[PDB]
Design a protein around this ligand. Structure first.
Ligand SMILES: Nc1ncnc2c1ncn2[C@@H]1O[C@H](COP(=O)(O)OP(=O)(O)OP(=O)(O)O)[C@@H](O)[C@H]1O
Ligand SMILES: [Mn+2]
Ligand SMILES: [Mn+2]
Ligand SMILES: [Mn+2]
Ligand code: NA
Lengths: 415, 551
C-alpha cells in the first residue's frame, strides 16, 4: 500500500563511492530480451535513460527462471549491495525461523514484482546505472537507472519490509502453523500439511497477495525433511596393503584437524620400515582399536560447532567424478555446519560448468532455508571457464559471492 | 556551427578545484599565430572573452604542420582532466568489419568539427580558462575560455557521443530498416533501398544533423567503394585494414609519445600483442608537453615489437546471419595456436593467434580449452552467438581429461579434425600402486638461509642415494628428489613423497613448465611405462619416509 509515498533516504557505506563494474558481453538473444523488457519498464516509469555524466555501472543479463518461455531481467547488484549502508530498519527483529528447515514442504514465491511500486530516493538512483550492450559495438549501448526499488538490491527488501509485514499479517492469522520467511525477492512458505493440502494453501496465499498489489508467477517446491548429511567414512577390506594403510593414515591425520579424538599410532607403527606399496601388510597392533575407536569418532559433532549469525558462511565444493559433487558449509575452518553431496543429473550428462552451477544454486537455497543467508563459494573451476558459461545455466534471482580456487588431495578426504 | 542541443551537466571530482596552471612565454610568431586562431574561434562563438574573476588557467601551445605552414592551437588539459569527473565508457570496443552484414546501399558520413558543434555546460566553462602570453611583455595577457567541447578535454568524447546518439534517435526510429553504426561522429549508413531512395534518406539524415548544427561536409564517402570507415576498407565482398604506420623519430616529445600511445591503444584492438607498458611509463610525471623525453631501452624495444606486429596485413569477408559460424584451431609451435572463424570454406571472417597463459605449469589440453573460451567470448561480442568448433583433439583424449581432472571443465559442441599436430596427454599416472615395481621413498630439504640442500631417496630393495645442491629451496629439492627416483629406476616405479606441492604439479599432468627441473621430470615421466605417485604426511614417522631423512 506504499505508492506515491515519500522515499526513504539511502546512503553508501562511509568513504565508498558507487560501483563501476564492466558489462559482460551478452548474446543477441539475451540483448533483444533485455531491450523489450527495459523499454516496457521505461514506459511504466520504473527506469529512465541517463546521460554519460553518470559514471556508475552494474552488469545486467537475462535468464529463463526455472523453466519458462519468458525472459526475466537480472541485475548483478553484488557490488552495489556491498557499498550500500547496512539497513537500519534492522527488520533483523524478524530472526530466521528454525522450523522452515523442519517442514515437510517449502514453496518459493517470487515477490520481486512488489518492489516496482515503491519510489527510490532520488539521490541514490544514479548508483543503480546499468548498460544494455550492443552487438559488435555498433552503437553506444543503452544506459538506464532505476527510479524505483530494484529487484536484487540489498535495500529493497529492507525498505519494503514493513509493507510486506502488513500484507502477510492477515494470512498468518487465518493460518497459524504456516511458516513464512523472506529472502531478497522471494517468499519462503513452508508447512507440514499433506502435499496437495500445501499446494492449496499456497495458491491461496498467491491470490491473497494478488488482491493486495503483489503479483507472483503461476504454479518451486522443496522438502527440507529429507535433506541429509554426508559423514566422513573410512574403507573396509579383508586384506590391507601398505598403500591402503598409508592412504588411511593420511586421511585420518587430516581428519584430526576436525576431531582430536583420532589416533594413528597403531597405524604409524604398521608403516615402520620401507616396504613395497603392494606388500599386503598384517592387521597388527590391535589396529582394530584405532580403526574401530576412530571409525566411531566420525559420529560426534565437532567441539563447539554453532551458527554465529555474525560471521559469513563459506562453501567449498569438490568435483568427485561421475556427475557427483561434495560440499561443506562452514564459518570457521574445520567447524562445518553441514557437509553434503549434490549428485543429481547423474549417469547420463557431460557438462561440469552446468553441474557446478546447478550445485551452487542448490547449496545456496539450502543455506537460505537453514540460516536465511547465502554463503560465499569457493568454486573448483578456473575464473575464465566459469565466467564464459555460468550465466547460461543460472536460474536464481540472486547471485552469491564467489572466488576461484585449486583443489588438491582434499577430494580424497570426502568421496 | 554550434548545436541548439541541451548541455550535459558537468562536475569536478568531489573535493577538487579548477586547474590553476601557469603558462610559459611563446615566440612572437606564435603569440600572434595563436591570437589569429583564437580570433577565428572567438568569432564563430567557440571560445569566449574573459578577464578578472577567473582564477584558472590551462597551459597553451602552438605547433605547425611541417608541410603547410599551418599553426594549430594545442591546449594542455592534463590538469583539468585529473580534476574533471569520471564519465562512463567510450567502448574499449570498436566495431569489427566481419561483424557487418552485406548492405546493398551504403554511405559513410563524418561530421566536420563535431566537438565545436556541441555546447559545454555553462557552469563548467570557467574551468577551461587559458591565456595567450604577451610579446611586448606589457599587455596583461589575453584570457580566454571555451563555450564548446574542447579537443583533449576528458569528457569531450563522451559528451559528444551522448549528443550524437540523441540527435540520431528520432531519425533512427523514423527509418527502422536503415542501419546506422556510430563510432564518435563516424556514421556508416547502410540500407536495403535502391540507389535512388537510399540517397534520398541520406539527404534527410544530412539535414536532420545540420538542423542540429552537426555538419556533414561534402566529403561524404562517395557512396562508392572502397569505403573507408574506422580504419578499414569496405569493399563490396571483402574488407581490409589500412596498414597502420607508426612514426620513426630521433627525438620524441611528451606530446608525441602521448599520441603514439593513443594510436597504439586503438590498434591493439585490431592486432593483439601491442604493448604500451614501457611507453606509458615515459608519460610518468608532469613534464612540459614539448620537453623532449628519451626512450628507455625497453620503450625503444617495445616500439620495435609493435612495428613488427602491424606489418602483417588483415582482411576478411562479411557476415551472413543465415549460415552458422565455424571456428577452427591449430596447435602451433609450443604454446601458440592459430584459429580461424568462417562460414564458408576458406572465406575467413576473422583469424588470430592465442598466446599461452601466465600459468607456471600447463598442458596442451588445458590451453586448447582456454583457447576455445577466448574465441567463444570473442564471437559473442562480434556476432552475438557462439561458433561451432572444429578441433584437433579426439573425443577419447578429452573424455579422459574431463575425467581425471579435478577442476570443473567443459568444451562446447565440436567436431574432430585430423590435421596434425594433435593435442594429447603425454603420460598417465597409475591409479593403483604397481606390484613388483621398485618403491622409492623420496625426500628433500634445504636451509631457508644458506640455500643449500639435500635431495635423496631410500627404496624397499635397500637402495639409497643423496645428492647435495647449492642455491635451492625446500620445494625445489622435493621435486629434485622426485626426479632422482625417476632417473634411477625401471620402466615402472612407485614413488612416495611427503610434499603436497610436488604432488600437485605432477598430478595436473603437465607437458610443459617454466622451470627446467619440472621439464626434466616431464620428459622422464613420458619415457616411463608405469608410474604411481603416492602421498603421506610429513614428520609423522610413516613408512620409509621417516627414514628417508638423511639430513
Ligand atoms: N573515428 C574516430 N577515432 C578517434 N577519435 C575520433 C574519431 N572521430 C572523432 N574523434 C575525436 O573527436 C575530435 C573531434 O572530431 P572532428 O569532427 O573535429 O574530427 P574527426 O571526426 O577526427 O574527423 P574530421 O577532422 O574529418 O572532421 C577528433 O579530433 C578526435 O579526437
Ligand atoms: Mn569529424
Ligand atoms: Mn570522426
Ligand atoms: Mn619432505
Ligand atoms: Na555491408
Amino acid at each position: 500500500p506504499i505508492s506515491p509515498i515519500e522515499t526513504v533516504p539511502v546512503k553508501l557505506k562511509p568513504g565508498m563511492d558507487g560501483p563501476k563494474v564492466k558489462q559482460w558481453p551478452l548474446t543477441e538473444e539475451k540483448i533483444k530480451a533485455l531491450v523489450e523488457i527495459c523499454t516496457e519498464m521505461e514506459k511504466e516509469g520504473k527506469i529512465s535513460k541517463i546521460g554519460p555524466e553518470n559514471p556508475y555501472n552494474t552488469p545486467v543479463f537475462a535468464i529463463k527462471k526455472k523453466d519458462s518461455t519468458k525472459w526475466r531481467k537480472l541485475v548483478d547488484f553484488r557490488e552495489l549491495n556491498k557499498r550500500t549502508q547496512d539497513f537500519w530498519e534492522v527488520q533483523l527483529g524478524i530472526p530466521h525461523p528454525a522450523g522452515l528447515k523442519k517442514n515437510k514442504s517449502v514453496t518459493v514465491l517470487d515477490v520481486g514484482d512488489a518492489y516496482f511500486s515503491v519510489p527510490l530516493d532520488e539521490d541514490f538512483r544514479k548508483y543503480t546505472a546499468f548498460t544494455i550492450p550492443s552487438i559488435n559495438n555498433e552503437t553506444p549501448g543503452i544506459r538506464y537507472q532505476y527510479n524505483v526499488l530494484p529487484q536484487g538490491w540489498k535495500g529493497s527488501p529492507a525498505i519494503f519490509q514493513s509493507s510486506m509485514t502488513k500484507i502477510l499479517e492477515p494470512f498468518k492469522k487465518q493460518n497459524p502453523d504456516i511458516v513464512i520467511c523472506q529472502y531478497m525477492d522471494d517468499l519462503y512458505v513452508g508447512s507440514d500439511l499433506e502435499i496437495g493440502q500445501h499446494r492449496t494453501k499456497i495458491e491461496e496465499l498467491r491470490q491473497h497477495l494478488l488482491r493486495w498489489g503483489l503479483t507472483t508467477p503461476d504454479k518451486y517446491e522443496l522438502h527440507p525433511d529429507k535433506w541429509t548429511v554426508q559423514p566422513i567414512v573410512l574403507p573396509e577390506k579383508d586384506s590391507w596393503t601398505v598403500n591402503d594403510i598409508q592412504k588411511l593414515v593420511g586421511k585420518l591425520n587430516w581428519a584430526s584437524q576436525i576431531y582430536p579424538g583420532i589416533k594413528v599410532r597403531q597405524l604409524s607403527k604398521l608403516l615402520r620400515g620401507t616396504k613395497a606399496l603392494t606388500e599386503v601388510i598384517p592387521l597388527t597392533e590391535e589396529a582394530e582399536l584405532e580403526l574401530a575407536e576412530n571409525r566411531e569418532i566420525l559420529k560426534e559433532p565437532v567441539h563447539g560447532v554453532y551458527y554465529d549469525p555474525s560471521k559469513d558462511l563459506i562453501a567449498e565444493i569438490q568435483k568427485q567424478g561421475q556427475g557427483q559433487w561434495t560440499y561443506q558449509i562452514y564459518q570457521e575452518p574445520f567447524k562445518n555446519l553441514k557437509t553434503g553431496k549434490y549428485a543429481r543429473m547423474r549417469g547420463a550428462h557431460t557438462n561440469d560448468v552446468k553441474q557446478l552451477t546447478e550445485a551452487v544454486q542448490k547449496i545456496t537455497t539450502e543455506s537460505i532455508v537453514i540460516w536465511g543467508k547465502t554463503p560465499k563459494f569457493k568454486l573448483p573451476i578456473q575464473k575464465e571457464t566459469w565466467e564464459t558459461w555460468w550465466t547460461e545455466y543460472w536460474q536464481a534471482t540472486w547471485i552469491p559471492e564467489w572466488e576461484f580456487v585449486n583443489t588438491p588431495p582434499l577430494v580424497k578426504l570426502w568421496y | 556551427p554550434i548545436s541548439p542541443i541541451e548541455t550535459v551537466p558537468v562536475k569536478l571530482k568531489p573535493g577538487m578545484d579548477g586547474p590553476k596552471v601557469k603558462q610559459w612565454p611563446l615566440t612572437e610568431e606564435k603569440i600572434k599565430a595563436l591570437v589569429e586562431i583564437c580570433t577565428e574561434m572567438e568569432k564563430e562563438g567557440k571560445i569566449s572573452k574573459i578577464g578578472p574573476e577567473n582564477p584558472y588557467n590551462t597551459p597553451v601551445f602552438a605547433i605547425k604542420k611541417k608541410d603547410s605552414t599551418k599553426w594549430r592551437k594545442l591546449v594542455d588539459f592534463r590538469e583539468l582532466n585529473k580534476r574533471t569527473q569520471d564519465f562512463w565508457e567510450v567502448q574499449l570496443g570498436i566495431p569489427h568489419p566481419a561483424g557487418l552484414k552485406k548492405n546493398k546501399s551504403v554511405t559513410v558520413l563524418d561530421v566536420g568539427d563535431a566537438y565545436f558543434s556541441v555546447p559545454l555546460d555553462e557552469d563548467f566553462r570557467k574551468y577551461t580558462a587559458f591565456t595567450i602570453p604577451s610579446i611586448n611583455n606589457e599587455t596583461p595577457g589575453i584570457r580566454y575560455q571555451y563555450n564548446v567541447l574542447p579537443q583533449g578535454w576528458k569528457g569531450s568524447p563522451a559528451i559528444f557521443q551522448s549528443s550524437m546518439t540523441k540527435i540520431l534517435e528520432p531519425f533512427k526510429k523514423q527509418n527502422p530498416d536503415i542501419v546506422i553504426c556510430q563510432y564518435m561522429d563516424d556514421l556508416y549508413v547502410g540500407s536495403d533501398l535502391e540507389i535512388g531512395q537510399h540517397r534520398t534518406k541520406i539527404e534527410e539524415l544530412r539535414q536532420h544533423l545540420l538542423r542540429w548544427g552537426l555538419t556533414t561536409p561534402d566529403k561524404k564517402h562517395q557512396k562508392e567503394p572502397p569505403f573507408l570507415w574506422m580504419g578499414y576498407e569496405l569493399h563490396p565482398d571483402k574488407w581490409t585494414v589500412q596498414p597502420i604506420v607508426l612514426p620513426e623519430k630521433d627525438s620524441w616529445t611528451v606530446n608525441d609519445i602521448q599520441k603514439l600511445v593513443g594510436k597504439l591503444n586503438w590498434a591493439s584492438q585490431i592486432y593483439p600483442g601491442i604493448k604500451v607498458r614501457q611507453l606509458s611509463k615515459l608519460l610518468r610525471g608532469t613534464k612540459a608537453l614539448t620537453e623532449v623525453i628519451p626512450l628507455t631501452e625497453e620503450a625503444e624495444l617495445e616500439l620495435a615489437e609493435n612495428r613488427e606486429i602491424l606489418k602483417e596485413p588483415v582482411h576478411g569477408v562479411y557476415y551472413d546471419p543465415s549460415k552458422d559460424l565455424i571456428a577452427e584451431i591449430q596447435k602451433q609451435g609450443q604454446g601458440q595456436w592459430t584459429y580461424q572463424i568462417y562460414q564458408e570454406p576458406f572465406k575467413n571472417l576473422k583469424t588470430g593467434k592465442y598466446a599461452r597463459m601466465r600459468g607456471a605449469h600447463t598442458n596442451d589440453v588445458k590451453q586448447l580449452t582456454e583457447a576455445v573460451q577466448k574465441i567463444t567470448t570473442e564471437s559473442i561480442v562480434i556476432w552475438g552467438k557462439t561458433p561451432k568448433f572444429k578441433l584437433p583433439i579426439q573425443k577419447e583424449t578429452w573424455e579422459t581429461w574431463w575425467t581425471e581432472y579435478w577442476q570443473a571443465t567443459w568444451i562446447p559442441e565440436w567436431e574432430f579434425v585430423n590435421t596434425p599436430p594433435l593435442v594429447k596427454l603425454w603420460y598417465q599416472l597409475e591409479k593403483e600402486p604397481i606390484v613388483g615395481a621398485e618403491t622409492f621413498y623420496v625426500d628433500g630439504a634445504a636451509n631457508r638461509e644458506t640455500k643449500l640442500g639435500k635431495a635423496g631417496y631410500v627404496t624397499n630393495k635397500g637402495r639409497q642415494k643423496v645428492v647435495p645442491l647449492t642455491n635451492t629451496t625446500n620445494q625445489k629439492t622435493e621435486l629434485q628428489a622426485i626426479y632422482l627416483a625417476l632417473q634411477d629406476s625401471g620402466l615402472e616405479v612407485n614413488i612416495v613423497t611427503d610434499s603436497q606441492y610436488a604432488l600437485g604439479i605432477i598430478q595436473a599432468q603437465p607437458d610443459k613448465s617454466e622451470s627446467e627441473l619440472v621439464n626434466q621430470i616431464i620428459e622422464q615421466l613420458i619415457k616411463k611405462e608405469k608410474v604411481y605417485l603416492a602421498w603421506v604426511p610429513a614428520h609423522k614417522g610413516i613408512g620409509g619416509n621417516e627414514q628417508v631423512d638423511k639430513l
